[PDB]
């Protein structure tokens, strides 16, 4: 039978923009602007 | 320390501190925000291309004991079990023995 | 190819009933959107004020 | 190395920028036995 | 443009051989149906046979 190879998913929320897409889901994230 | 004190009959040159302050500022803003933007389209460039390269990584090896399925999956023309499974996850598949 | 004019990336389709040139719908649009998306980062990402 | 704080600060600082949020992906587009890379994590 | 020759060349599979010019040629007649279904990515591979 099949071995498949993919990568991680997971329930983020979290959205970042880049160059080409805007709104983009991401599994992780780092907020380098420090807010508080 | 940012921020200087200057007389009312200053003004010319409490406008150049603003200006340095003003300017300073766009060039940072500017380069932040295009930083974030680049390192995040080259982010999930990589991360894609991370998961293709193992795809052909495992491609390379299996060679022709198997199909591709074009789901992103292989499938094996001999039977397979945690041995055989495992060499491929190990990089070790031992193509010579198997074949259809 | 010269002749296809409707979109970025397409196909030649050469069967036995003709050949016709057609853009490949899901690939000109992401890259479009992708391109404006850039052109637009560059522009509106400047910042403006009285000087 | 940003922050959005306050213009004017006193001390070894973040540098100041107009910007509500600066955040990087680290992680993998979250796209959400059948499949591999091909249709989602 | 790669990118797009490879979904191409994952669905039609083993039914076409490529030319190496950045196009395919099938095995078996390919008539209107079958070329739109590859532009769709509908490609209805188990159907057809060298
Ligand atoms: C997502 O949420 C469900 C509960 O609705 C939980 O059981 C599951 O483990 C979560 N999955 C991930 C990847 O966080
Ligand atoms: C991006 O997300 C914001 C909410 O934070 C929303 O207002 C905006 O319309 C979204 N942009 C696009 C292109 O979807
Ligand atoms: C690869 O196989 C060898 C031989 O059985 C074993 O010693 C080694 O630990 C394996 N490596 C991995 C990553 O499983
Ligand atoms: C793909 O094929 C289906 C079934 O005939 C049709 O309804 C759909 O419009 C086609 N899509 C494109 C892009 O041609």
Same mark, same amino acid.
């Given at each position: 039978?099949?071995?498949?190879?993919?990568?991680?998913?997971?329930?983020?929320?979290?959205?970042?923009?880049?160059?080409?897409?805007?709104?983009?889901?991401?599994?992780?994230?780092?907020?380098?602007?420090?807010?508080? | 320390?940012?921020?200087?004190?200057?007389?009312?009959?200053?003004?010319?040159?409490?406008?150049?501190?603003?200006?340095?302050?003003?300017?300073?500022?766009?060039?940072?803003?500017?380069?932040?925000?295009?930083?974030?933007?680049?390192?995040?389209?080259?982010?999930?460039?990589?991360?894609?291309?991370?998961?293709?390269?193992?795809?052909?990584?495992?491609?390379?090896?299996?060679?022709?004991?198997?199909?591709?399925?074009?789901?992103?999956?292989?499938?094996?023309?001999?039977?397979?079990?945690?041995?055989?499974?495992?060499?491929?996850?190990?990089?070790?598949?031992?193509?010579?023995?198997?074949?259809? | 190819?010269?002749?296809?004019?409707?979109?970025?990336?397409?196909?030649?389709?050469?069967?036995?009933?003709?050949?016709?040139?057609?853009?490949?719908?899901?690939?000109?649009?992401?890259?479009?959107?992708?391109?404006?998306?850039?052109?637009?980062?560059?522009?509106?990402?400047?910042?403006?004020?009285?000087? | 190395?940003?922050?959005? /704080?306050?213009?004017?600060?006193?001390?070894?600082? +973040?540098?100041?920028?107009?910007?509500?949020?600066? /955040?990087?992906?680290?992680?993998?587009?979250?796209? +959400?036995?059948?499949?591999?890379?091909?249709?989602?994590?």
């Amino acid at each position: 039978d099949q071995i498949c190879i993919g990568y991680h998913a997971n329930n983020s929320t979290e959205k970042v923009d880049t160059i080409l897409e805007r709104n983009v889901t991401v599994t992780h994230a780092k907020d380098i602007l420090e807010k508080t | 320390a940012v921020g200087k004190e200057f007389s009312n009959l200053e003004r010319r040159l409490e406008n150049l501190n603003k200006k340095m302050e003003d300017g300073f500022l766009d060039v940072w803003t500017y380069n932040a925000e295009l930083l974030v933007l680049m390192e995040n389209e080259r982010t999930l460039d990589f991360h894609d291309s991370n998961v293709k390269n193992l795809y052909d990584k495992v491609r390379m090896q299996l060679r022709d004991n198997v199909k591709e399925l074009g789901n992103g999956c292989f499938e094996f023309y001999h039977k397979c079990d945690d041995e055989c499974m495992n060499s491929v996850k190990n990089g070790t598949y031992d193509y010579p023995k198997y074949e259809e | 190819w010269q002749g296809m004019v409707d979109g970025w990336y397409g196909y030649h389709h050469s069967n036995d009933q003709g050949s016709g040139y057609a853009a490949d719908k899901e690939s000109t649009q992401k890259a479009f959107d992708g391109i404006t998306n850039k052109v637009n980062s560059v522009i509106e990402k400047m910042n403006t004020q009285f000087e | 190395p940003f922050h959005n /704080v306050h213009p004017l600060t006193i001390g070894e600082c +973040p540098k100041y920028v107009k910007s509500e949020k600066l /955040v990087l992906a680290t992680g993998l587009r979250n796209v +959400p036995a059948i499949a591999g890379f091909i249709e989602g994590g």
